[PDB]
Structure formats: C-alpha cells, structure tokens
Specification:
Structural class of chain A: mainly beta
Oligomer: part of a larger assembly
Order of helices and strands of chain A: EEEEEEEEEEEEEEEEHEHEEH
Distance between the termini of chain A: 79 Å
Protein name (chain A): Spike protein S1
Bound molecules: a molecule of 2 linked components (NAG-NAG), 2-acetamido-2-deoxy-beta-D-glucopyranose
C-alpha cells in the first residue's frame, strides 16, 4: 500500500567533517524540507503462494538523491536499486547488504521485479553484460536489539550521487515506541564514499518476499492512511542554518526557505528574533519560457570556400571576405583544417553558435611558424606592424594550421 | 515586478506567527500571484488572500487593519506600524497614534497656575567611549 | 539589495558573489541603520510633545495674527499657508508611493523606503506644539500645558529679556501690527 | 600539519568532546581552534602564539 | 524607584549596549572575512603555497591580499565614522556634565524634561548615565487674570 | 555569459563584480558621512526646538 | 586573556582604556561630593 | 609603455590604476571624515563666538572655567583662538548661615 505523512523536522546531517561548538554556521546543500510530504510504501507478498501475484512494485523516481527511513525486524529490507531506462540500453545499480557484507555493481541489469529470493541472489537482474565497477566491505547497517519490539529501530539513510562519492549518512534511533516519525531531532554521519558516474533517475528497493508478514491490503491512495513502515523522501538543494551544540553535535536547525520566520532566523544568524521589522530578500517573477527571435535565415554562408582554398594570398596582401545574411554553424568547420591552434579572444568558440553578429569578416593568408603567434592585438615586429595589425579592441579570433605538406 | 521583502514579527518567544510586507508593490498584481517555481521566495505558503492590507510602503500580508491607533511598536512606513494584539493573539497593522489628543482652555483672561509640584528623576544614557582597538 | 544590484538574476554570478564572505549582510545592516536613524531623527526633532494640542475654536490673540502659520482646514493637507509655500518650493524626487522615469529606471535593487512619519502627522505634531507654544507658552515644555493668554505670555517673554511688561502693555497694538507685517 | 591542516601555535591537551567522526575544531571565526591527532586519536587544543 | 525602573525595564541602556555590540559585531565580521576565497582557489596561505607554485601563487596571493586589505579598509572606514559620532556624543556629554552637573541650566528640555534642578552623573561601561533631577509643575488650577 | 565559456567568464565576472562592489561601497561610505552630518544637524534642530 | 575574544590571534587586539573603572568611579564620586556639598 | 606591449600592458596598467584609485579613494574618505570633524568644531566655534563674544553666557564651563565675563577672539592659522575672561571667586572665608 501507499500513504502520505508529514516529514516534521528530520533529515539533517553534518555537511562537513569539521567540528564545531556553540556556532550557528549555515550552509547550502541537499537537505529535506521541514514539514514536507513523505510517501509510505508496502509490498504484499504474503498471499503470493495462493496465486494472486504480488503486483505491488512502483518505479520510484530518484531525482536529486533520496532519503530513506524504515523499521525492519532484522533484515526485512536488504538493499536498493538505482539506474534508468531499466533495460540494457542504460546502466543500473545493485546496492544490497549481506549479513556483514555489501556488494555494489553498476552493470547494465535488465529485470522486471524486486524479489531477492533468500529467507540467495538472481530474480532481480538477468544481465551481467558490461559491468564497469564493483565494491565490497563492511555493510552500512548494524542491527541492535533491545530484547523486544517496543524499541522500534529507525534507519535514517541519506542517499546522494553528486559527482560520485556516494554517501551513507545514517544513524540508529531505536527510541521509537510506535509513533511514526516521532517529534524530535537527530543528526546523520557518513560512513563511506566512492565515485561511479551514472545518470540515475529511478529508485527501487529489495524486500524479503520469501517470508513476509504484516502487509494489509487496501485501496488507500490520494492522501489516505495505511500502514507501510517504510518511508522515502527526496532532497532538493536548500540553505540550512544549523545549531552546533557545545558538545559538538547538532541540537536543532531551521530552514531558510520554508517560512518567512525561518528566513529571518537564517538571514540574521540567530535562533531568536525579537520584535521588529527585518529585510530578507526580494521576489522575482520567474520566466515561463524562453523566446528566440534569430532572423529567419537558412542559406549557409560559404566557409568551406574561404577555409579550404588552394591560392591563399600572401600576408602583405591578405584575402578579405565579407559574410552576409546567413546562419553559420561553427561546428562543421572542425574537419576543414588540422586546427593546430584554435585560441579565441573575448568571444569564446564554445557557445559561439548562440550569438548574432552585425557582420562577419574573414581574412586568410600565410605566415611563418615563428610568427604564427605574432598576429595579436598590439603585437610588434615585422608582419605585426608592417603587413597586418589587429587593433587592441579586436573581437573575434584567429585560426592557424600547418600547410607544410602543400606549400612545400 | 520585483521589490524588497520585509518580515514583521514579534519576539520569537511571543509567537511563531509573522506578517510579511512587500516593499513598494501593489498585491493585486504580483505578490498574490504565486506558483511553485514562479517566485524566488519559496516561503510563499502564506495565503495572499487573508489579512491583506495595502500600505503606501507596499502592501502588507499577514495582518488586518484596525481603526484603533496606539503607540506603534514595529515601524513600517507612511504612518503605519503593526504590533501584536490580544483579540486570541494575532498581528494587527494600524495607523500611528500621534499621541494623547488634548485640548486647552485659552481665554483672554483665564490663567492656569500649579499649586503642587512633582520632582521626577530621568535618565540620559550618553556613550563617551568605544572599545579602543589596534590592527 | 546587493544580489539584485550586482548579479541581476544570474545564478553563476550570485554563486561567485556568495564566496566574497559576509560583505553584503554588513552592507544591508549599514543602510538599515541609516534608515532607522532617519526615522529616529524625525521622531526626536518633532515628537517633543507627549500629547497633541489643538488651537481654540476662536482665534484672537490681542491683535496677533497667526493665520499664515496655523494650519487651515480649507487646504486638503491640513498645513499652514507657509508650510504649503515650502512644499511647493521644494521639488521632492521620490517618496516610495508604489509608482510601479529616473525613479522608474531603478530596477536595480535601489529602493527608497518612505519615512515613517508621513507629511500629515508631522503637520499634526507641528500644529500641536504651535498650539502649545501660543496658548501655554513654555509651561507645556515642562509639565501639563498651562492655559495663559497670549498678551500676558508676550509680556512675560519681554520680562525675559529685561524690557518689563509696561512696554508691551503700552505698545500692544504696535507689536501686534509689527508681528503681523513680519509674518506676512 | 595535522592531516594537511597547517598553522603555528602551542598545543595543549584539550577538554573538548569531538564526536567519533569530527576531526578539526572550530569557533565562530571559520578558523580552527582544536584538533584531534590522527594517530593518537586524542583531542588536542590549538592556541596560536 | 529609578533603580527599580532600570532593573525591571527590558532595555534602558540601549545606547551603551549598541556601542559594545557594534564593535563586537564589526570585529567578528572582520575575523570571519578571513575565510573567503575572494576568487582564489583557497583561503589558506600554507596550502595555496605548498600545492601551488610561485608563478601563479603570486597572483593568487595578490588577489587574496587585495580582498583582505579592502575588507580591513571598510572596517576602519566605518570605525572613523563611529568614533566621530561617539566624539559628537561625548562632546554633548561633556557640555551636559559641565552644565547640568556643575550648575543649573536655563536651557529648557536639555537636562531632562521640565525645569531643571541639578543632575548626578554615574559611571557606566563605555558611557555615562545622568540622573537629572527636574521640577515638574504637576497639578494646576485655573484662575482669572488681568 | 552568452559569449564566453565558464573557465574565463569566471574571471571576467569576478573583475566586473569587484568593480561594482567597490562602486557600491563608495556610495555607502558617502551615505554614512552624510548621515553623520544630518544627525548632527538634526540634533542641533532638536536642541533648537 | 591570551572563546570568541580568545580566538583573536589575528593581530586584532583591544587596548584597555587609560582610565580603568576604579578611577572613573573616583571622578564621579568626587564631583558628586562637589555638587552636593 | 616602453617595455611591454599593449596586450599585457593593458592588464598591468589596469592593476596599477585600480591600486592608485583605491589609494586616492582612501585619501578622500579620510578627508570627508576630517572635514566632518572640522565642521562640527567650526559649528562649536560659531556658537562660542555668538554666545561668549556677543554677550554673557549663563552656561557653566562653556566660555572658559568659572563665571564668564566676555571673550575676545583672535585669528589663528586655520583656526580661531578665544581669550575668555572669567570671574573666579578666589580666596574665601567660612560663615554661619540659617
Ligand atoms: C553475500 O552475498 C554475496 C553476493 O550477493 C556473496 O559474495 C561472495 O563473497 C565471498 C567472500 O569470500 C566470495 O568468496 C564469493 O566469491 C562471493 N560471491 C560472489 C557471487 O561474488 C556472499 O554470499 C556474501 N558476501 C560476502 C560473504 O562477502
Ligand atoms: C556489451 O556487451 C555485449 C556482449 O555481447 C557487446 O556486444 C558485442 O560486443 C562485441 C565486442 O567485440 C562487438 O564487436 C559487437 O558489435 C557487440 N554486439 C552488439 C553491440 O550488438 C557490447 O559491445 C557491449 N557494450 C558495451 C558498451 O560495452
Ligand atoms: C537520464 O536519462 C534519461 C533517459 O530517458 C533522460 O530523460 C530524457 O532526457 C531528455 C533530455 O532532456 C528528454 O528528452 C527527456 O527529459 C527524457 N526523455 C524521455 C523520452 O523521457 C534524463 O534527462 C537523463 N538525465 C540527465 C541528467 O541527463
Ligand atoms: C577541399 O575541397 C575539395 C573539393 O574541391 C575536397 O577534396 C576532397 O579531399 C578528400 C581528402 O583528400 C578526398 O577524400 C575527396 O575525394 C576530395 N573530393 C574532391 C571532390 O576533391 C576537400 O573538401 C578539400 N580538399 C583538400 C585537399 O583539403
Ligand atoms: C578574396 O576572397 C576570396 C578568398 O580567397 C577570393 O576568391 C573569390 O572570392 C569571391 C568573393 O569575393 C568569390 O565570389 C569567388 O568565387 C572566389 N573565387 C574565385 C576563383 O574568384 C578572392 O579572389 C580574393 N580577392 C582578392 C585576393 O582580391
Ligand atoms: C501531500 O500530497 C497530498 C496528495 O499528493 C496533498 O493532498 C497534500 O496537501 C500534500 N501535503 C504537503 C505538505 O505537501
Ligand atoms: C557533553 O560533554 C560533557 C563533558 O564533556 C559530558 O558530561 C556530557 O555527557 C556530554 N553530552 C553528551 C555526550 O551527550
Ligand atoms: C521568552 O519568553 C518566555 C515566556 O514569555 C520566557 O519563558 C523565556 O525565558 C523568554 N526567553 C528570553 C530569551 O527572553
Ligand atoms: C473603521 O471605520 C470605518 C467606518 O467607521 C469602517 O472601515 C469600519 O466600520 C471601522 N472598523 C472598525 C473595526 O470599527
Ligand atoms: C475676548 O475676545 C473676544 C473676541 O474679541 C471678546 O468678545 C471678549 O470680550 C474678549 N474678552 C476680554 C476679557 O477681553
Ligand atoms: C497602488 O495602490 C495604492 C493604494 O491604493 C495607490 O496609491 C497606487 O497609485 C497604486 N499603484 C499605482 C501604480 O497606481
Ligand atoms: C597507533 O599505533 C601505535 C603504534 O604504531 C599503537 O601503539 C597505537 O595503539 C595505535 N593507535 C592509537 C590510537 O594510537
């Protein structure tokens, strides 16, 4: 089943490894919005034997990391699944824990369900085709029992893939007595880091379907109630102001984008705001779309003619060509010359195809190797002051390549 | 239609309720208009439809007008100050009370002369020095 | 607004600015101090009186004419003719009135916060303390305003500078005419 | 030069209570005030000269 | 009752509190200004020297030093203004001490409100507080005069 | 930001932003002195009143 | 004092005022004696 | 401009001029505060002239120490210098009062 809940104030980790005490340092990073929407999920496989099929597995989006929180008895949940497009068309992740082990792969895994047969492997992937990376060692989660189920363990996991170095920000809080996401505040610390490099926009997890229990069935949806005992949250980039305790932990924190009171507490570095008016920021109407109005031209102005020529003029008599109304793509010219030197000036060639010019001028000639760099705005010598000079305010750029094969 | 944003709040240990003031903008145009990923301040959870008063310094969100005028606590501008008022606690924005309205009994022959006085001690706190420092 | 004035709606420029340290929160605090100091300046200069006085319904001051300095109900701003003369003489540029061309072109985070005491309560302060100083003399500068007739208050001011009351009470018409001509 | 963090000053045995993961101390200056020895795993204090 | 007023008031020594807190805040901002990249790779000199090499380390340190010097410059620039305002307030206090304390003042509403009798200054941290003793005519009665 | 590439657009933006920041700092430094002068004049006006 | 104030190992020192707050009190008491005797 | 070439001389000159401009800005920032202080002192001097010189001042310790009698100003280089004339009760004797 699926149900909604209110995040309250949770999902706060230490942004850095560094220690603080009685400081109110603020930071910008991925975090959980306070009092945000959190989605419960439950997988019913108890009746799988008597046919009827589980039929309960959505494809959870992963966009900008995921927050994880749940309560499993010993190992009811095992691992998670990343990737995109499912099929071998693109890669996928296979993070899963084993007793006191963890195995990570980025192989192109094609599958249909999430049944990690055990209470083994397989059933959740069918292609070890072109695996690129693997990893092992100590698992993330350590189980602790209070000799009874009253101390419901809560495993808060912060999951991110920002330029690799995948984060295991986690903590154990078995202080729960039954209430879902109890009021309070705890922090999260990292365990390991590792880079892979992969476009993840899909999330799935692994449950123990071979022996499951307490999975009631109903049609709860669209902001309804239902017991799932498995929470998932998504992160968005925010600014947070954190209260570091005297001991060094995090006692409490406030958002900087949720409520104007919190915005005040963030813009003036204090948890307490007295009576008065304060200035925080502005408000700007965001653009709905982007309009382009480049002139409706299609005739590609001749650049092959000027570049790939056979009678390039001398430096003392340079060959000047005017460019008129045309849409010029400055990306098909890379195969027109060896391009020994393609340095460019205040206009950079990279996003040169998104600009409009009054008029474009090209001048082609030949010079010696020791003077290939002599042509620049304000250079002096023989050619640079006698045959061709560039003005100091010149905008544009020069193209150079060796013609020793032909002009020999 | 950008502009400054000001938060009007009483002391944090008096309430957690604030009234937002937008600087120099009429609400009927932009600050009422709000959507996800449309205005840079994402604290826009405020209704923009309740307790919407219009002030020459830009209109105010979160407090309702009161005809009554008192010595004003949180200055706003254009003779407007909002303050916390017990209804049962909400932020109210009113026009400044200039002071106790008083009259005099001027006549071409009447005079007023005191018969008993009152010695009162006041305090004027004048700084004379600041923390000397060297860099 | 530092961000608006420096990096107009450019995320990259804003990011490059953020590293500059708290060099603009301080800049905001400086100008906030300036603005609150302006409001305190006006409040301290004008709000010397705890209570607002009104002139008596009748206007006779032993020949003294205060028509040019006392506010008139005829004009819609409740100001003195002289005060209106000064308002006309001074060409104010901006006042922050939700204008929504020189002021308009300031789409650059440069805003002008309107003064706390608008020029209809400053006029009320001025009129109140004028009523105080022309019906009670100095006594309203110390305690409760003491109703004292104006020719007698005038003779008392003359006593202040060693001229004695007899000069005033023997020249009252002359002093009234000179005062009225000067005020005009 | 503790773990690449430099600085010049006297080091005393500190009474701070760095959590198992926190390494370099701080104050409200964005400047280090205490450090944990990476080898001895004990919490020193930093006080410049 | 003036002692009780000062004790039970929320904040009466607002001017001295602001004078102390302004320097505290300026000092803290100045010190916090050390940790800013100012458009340099890092804000730590030992690292920016060891990792880098003098060719571009010179220009990186130049950028950091000009940023740091400008930040220090703004501190003293506002310090001169603050000390000039404090000089004006101290000159005002000196005249008040020279008059209100060492004699009666015929200046109305200078040494407290009302007609002035005397004053007693008291030392304060980074300032002085005056105890103006003033005569207020209090209750009155109307009469008929000529 | 439409013409350059980030590598050097960063330094171009940094030069422009430091120029703009110096210009803004000049304005506020002048404003503080103007406010000091206005406060002196307003205190004189308060005494005069 | 060689934590906020102790942190200033950055050439930022505060100098004690010339008149410590035990001779300023003597000044105040002396001129009080003058103004009441 | 005799050694370098415009390409890099532009940035070198730019660094030099921004340094020199910062130095000049500092001078006039200090000048503004100095002139504000001098303006306050000159307002004090003008009030002192109009009060002490043009009449007696009942303000204690304003025009010199002691009860004030008059004041004769004297021109000074970039300043004014007053000669306050003051009445000091000098030697005294105790008495019995009721
Ligand atoms: C947990 O499961 C993994 C596979 O999901 C298994 O990994 C084996 O680990 C042992 C440890 O020495 C290796 O010898 C085997 O070659 C691994 N098998 C495979 C298929 O990689 C194993 O069952 C568990 N992992 C451990 C014990 O580290
Ligand atoms: C993924 O693995 C498959 C395994 O068959 C690769 O498929 C063939 O790989 C050989 C390698 O010599 C190529 O010559 C064939 O053309 C491939 N067949 C295809 C693509 O249909 C495949 O190349 C691997 N892909 C990657 C990206 O490593
Ligand atoms: C990760 O891969 C998915 C594959 O679908 C990308 O989704 C597509 O992105 C393109 C480019 O913007 C658009 O056509 C659509 O947004 C998606 N296509 C379809 C058919 O849905 C996704 O953008 C990739 N992520 C990143 C960061 O590039
Ligand atoms: C210049 O233009 C000519 C067309 O006039 C092209 O010549 C081609 O050169 C490639 C590489 O040597 C050959 O494979 C083609 O067969 C040539 N085609 C023709 C029609 O000549 C080419 O674009 C340029 N040639 C050179 C030498 O730069
Ligand atoms: C300069 O421009 C081009 C570049 O070498 C030379 O070639 C001719 O340019 C004209 C345009 O001006 C084209 O219409 C012709 O098709 C180009 N080719 C020929 C064979 O004429 C042009 O001759 C040069 N002019 C000079 C050097 O005076
Ligand atoms: C959460 O989502 C439900 C339905 O999607 C919606 O009714 C509810 O208002 C949302 N709550 C929050 C806090 O976003
Ligand atoms: C904080 O530190 C003190 C002293 O080091 C200790 O007594 C206290 O238990 C600590 N608090 C914790 C560990 O939560
Ligand atoms: C805030 O107010 C509450 C009750 O009004 C009081 O208990 C608390 O001590 C106050 N805190 C501060 C810092 O003034
Ligand atoms: C305020 O005054 C007018 C009419 O007197 C009107 O807006 C309203 O009735 C009044 N409001 C209250 C609360 O009295
Ligand atoms: C006061 O003035 C009014 C109006 O001129 C006059 O009628 C009245 O007699 C005057 N009273 C005295 C005592 O002069
Ligand atoms: C905005 O509303 C105020 C108050 O009604 C009005 O004075 C102002 O003119 C309005 N804005 C414009 C641009 O008319
Ligand atoms: C570090 O190593 C030394 C010897 O190499 C050893 O005695 C010590 O126990 C180790 N751990 C710590 C925390 O010092």
């Amino acid at each position: 089943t699926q149900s909604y809940t209110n995040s309250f104030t949770r999902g706060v980790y230490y942004p850095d490894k560094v220690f603080r005490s009685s400081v109110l340092h603020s930071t910008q990073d991925l975090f959980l919005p306070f009092f945000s929407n959190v989605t419960w999920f439950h997988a019913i496989h108890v009746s799988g034997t008597n046919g009827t099929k589980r039929f309960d597995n959505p494809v959870l989006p992963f966009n900008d990391g995921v927050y994880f929180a749940s309560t499993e008895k010993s190992n009811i949940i095992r691992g998670w699944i990343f990737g995109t497009t499912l099929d071998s068309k693109t890669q996928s992740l296979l993070i899963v824990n084993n007793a006191t082990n963890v195995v990570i792969k980025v192989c192109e895994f094609q599958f249909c369900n999430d049944p990690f047969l055990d209470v083994s492997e397989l059933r959740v992937y069918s292609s070890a085709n072109n695996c690129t990376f693997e990893y092992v060692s100590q698992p993330f989660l350590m189980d602790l029992e209070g000799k009874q189920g009253n101390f419901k363990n809560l495993r808060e996991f912060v999951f991110k893939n920002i330029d690799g170095y995948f984060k295991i920000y986690s903590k154990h809080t078995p202080v729960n007595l039954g209430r879902d996401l109890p009021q309070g505040f705890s922090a999260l610390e990292p365990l390991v880091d590792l880079p892979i490099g992969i476009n993840i926009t899909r999330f799935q997890t692994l449950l123990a379907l071979h022996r499951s229990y307490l999975t009631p069935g109903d049609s709860s949806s669209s902001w309804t109630a239902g017991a799932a005992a498995y929470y998932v949250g998504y992160l968005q980039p925010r600014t947070f102001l954190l209260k570091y305790n005297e001991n060094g932990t995090i006692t409490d924190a406030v958002d900087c984008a949720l409520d104007p009171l919190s915005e005040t507490k963030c813009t003036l570095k204090s948890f307490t705001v007295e009576k008065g008016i304060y200035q925080t920021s502005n408000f700007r109407v965001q653009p709905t779309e982007s309009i382009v109005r480049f002139p409706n031209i299609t005739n590609l102005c001749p650049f092959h003619e000027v570049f790939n020529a056979t009678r390039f003029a001398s430096v003392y008599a340079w060959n000047r060509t005017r460019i008129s109304n045309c849409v010029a793509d400055y990306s098909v010219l890379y195969n027109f010359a060896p391009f020994f030197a393609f340095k460019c000036y205040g206009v950079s060639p990279t996003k040169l195809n998104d600009l409009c010019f009054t008029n474009v001028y090209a001048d082609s000639f030949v010079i010696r190797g020791n003077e290939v760099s002599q042509i620049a705005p304000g250079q002096t010598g023989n050619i640079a002051d006698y045959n061709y000079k560039l003005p100091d305010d010149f905008t544009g750029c020069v193209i150079a390549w060796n013609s020793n094969k032909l002009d020999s | 239609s950008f502009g400054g944003v000001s938060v009007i709040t009483p002391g944090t240990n008096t309430s957690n309720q604030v009234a937002v003031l937008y600087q120099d903008v009429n609400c009927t145009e932009v600050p009422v208009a709000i959507h996800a990923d449309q205005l840079t301040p994402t604290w826009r959870v405020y209704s923009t439809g309740s307790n919407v008063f219009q002030t020459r310094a830009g209109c105010l969100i979160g407090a309702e007008y009161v005809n009554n005028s008192y010595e004003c606590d949180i200055p706003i501008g254009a003779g407007i100050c909002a303050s916390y008022q017990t209804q049962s606690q909400s932020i109210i924005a009113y026009t400044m009370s200039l002071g106790a309205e008083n009259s005099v009994a001027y006549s071409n022959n009447s005079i007023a002369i005191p018969t008993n006085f009152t010695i009162s001690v006041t305090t004027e706190i004048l700084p004379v020095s600041m923390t000397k420092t060297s860099v | 607004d530092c961000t608006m004035y420096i990096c107009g709606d450019s995320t990259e420029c804003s990011n490059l600015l953020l590293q500059y340290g708290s060099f603009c929160t301080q800049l905001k605090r400086a100008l906030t101090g300036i603005a609150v100091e302006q409001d305190k300046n006006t409040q301290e200069v004008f709000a010397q009186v705890k209570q607002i006085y009104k002139t008596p319904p009748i206007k006779y001051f032993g020949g003294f004419n205060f028509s040019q300095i006392l506010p008139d109900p005829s004009k819609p701003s409740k100001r003195s003719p002289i005060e209106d003369l000064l308002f006309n003489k001074v060409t104010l540029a901006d006042a922050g009135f939700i204008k929504q061309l020189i002021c308009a072109q300031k789409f650059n985070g440069l805003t002008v916060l309107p003064p706390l005491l608008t020029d209809e309560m400053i006029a009320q302060y001025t009129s109140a303390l004028l009523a105080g100083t022309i019906t009670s003399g100095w006594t309203f500068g110390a305690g409760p305003a003491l109703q004292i007739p104006f020719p007698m208050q005038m003779a008392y001011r003359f006593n202040g500078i060693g001229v004695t009351q007899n000069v005033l009470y023997e020249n009252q018409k002359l002093i009234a005419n000179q005062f009225n001509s000067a005020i005009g | 030069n503790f773990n690449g963090l430099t600085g010049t000053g006297v080091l005393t045995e500190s009474n701070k209570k760095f959590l198992p993961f926190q390494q370099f101390g701080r104050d409200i200056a964005d400047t280090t005030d205490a450090v944990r020895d990476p080898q001895t795993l004990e919490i020193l204090d930093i006080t410049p000269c | 009752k003036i002692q009780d007023s000062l004790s039970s008031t929320p904040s009466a020594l607002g001017k001295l509190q602001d004078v102390v807190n302004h320097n505290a805040q300026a000092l803290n901002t100045l010190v916090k200004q050390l940790s800013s990249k100012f458009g340099a790779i890092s804000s730590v000199l030992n690292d920016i020297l060891s990792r880098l090499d003098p060719p571009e380390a010179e220009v990186q340190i130049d950028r950091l030093i000009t940023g740091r010097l400008q930040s220090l410059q703004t501190y003293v620039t506002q310090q001169l203004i603050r000390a000039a305002e404090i000089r004006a307030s101290a000159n005002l206090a000196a005249t008040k001490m020279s008059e209100c304390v060492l004699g009666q003042s015929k200046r109305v509403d200078f040494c407290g409100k009302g007609y002035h009798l005397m004053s007693f200054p008291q030392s304060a941290p980074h300032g002085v507080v005056f105890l103006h003793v003033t005569y207020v005519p209090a209750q009155e009665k109307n009469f008929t005069t000529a």
